[PDB]
Write a protein that binds this ligand. Structure first.
Ligand code: EMC
Ligand code: EMC
Lengths: 92, 103, 52
């Protein structure tokens, strides 16, 4: 009476509160794993986006090394830099 | 025999976890390496291209610069390229210890 | 791009020096930004394992 009355059912109750919490927690984990991964994405995809400018800049610099302040390259390079930048502001 | 199931769960869990960390570690280091390269490999092409162009017929004035330039950009990538490799090589070496613990 | 539509002989030497500084500068600044970011990415790695 007492066993099959309150005891066993009580146990079956915690087994559920546990299995219940086990689940919510497992999902609380899946979330973090998704959140972390999303951050890591944003980061590298930014890294590389900054990369785009870097290279352009780095190039333009070398062009300045020709001395011809009038060289089409250095002039164009300088114009591109202003575009590459502008596009960086819109998407990102 | 519950302990059995337990103790090993413990071990494998923590190891398998470290392995992931290690894997993830590599990935980032790969990205860096490659990206670093893609950056230089990119300015470089523009400069080599320019050199090939500006010196169809010898350009006596820009000659000294072109030379200095060719050197810097080459010298530079050469270094950058090297470090990329070492970075990668080291990442490869990382898994070794874990790989043993696994076995 | 403006001051040298037609070559400006006087400002020529400055313009060059300037082009260098500003470019050189951003080049460095830009680089460090990347490393900073890359390091941030690396940060989650340990935790990501502990999670699993
Ligand atoms: C802040 C305009 Hg590229
Ligand atoms: C311009 C050779 Hg990666």
């Amino acid at each position: 009476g007492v066993v099959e009355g309150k005891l066993i059912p009580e146990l079956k109750n915690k087994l559920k509160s546990v299995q219940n919490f086990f689940t919510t927690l497992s999902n609380t984990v899946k979330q973090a794993n998704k959140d972390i991964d999303a951050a890591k994405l944003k980061l590298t995809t930014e890294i590389a986006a900054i990369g785009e400018i870097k290279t352009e800049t780095e190039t333009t610099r070398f062009y300045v090394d020709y001395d011809d302040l009038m060289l089409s390259l250095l002039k164009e390079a300088a114009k591109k830099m202003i575009n590459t930048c502008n596009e960086y502001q819109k998407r990102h | 025999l519950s302990r059995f199931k337990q103790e090993y769960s413990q071990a494998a869990s923590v190891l398998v976890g470290d392995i992931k960390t290690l894997l993830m570690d590599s990935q980032d280091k790969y990205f860096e390496a490659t990206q670093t390269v893609y950056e230089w490999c990119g300015v470089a092409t523009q400069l080599l291209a320019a050199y090939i162009l500006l010196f169809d017929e010898y350009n006596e004035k820009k000659a000294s610069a072109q030379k200095d330039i060719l050197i810097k950009v080459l010298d530079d990538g050469i270094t950058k390229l090297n470090e990329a490799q070492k970075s990668l090589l080291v990442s490869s070496q990382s898994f070794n210890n874990a790989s043993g613990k696994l076995l």
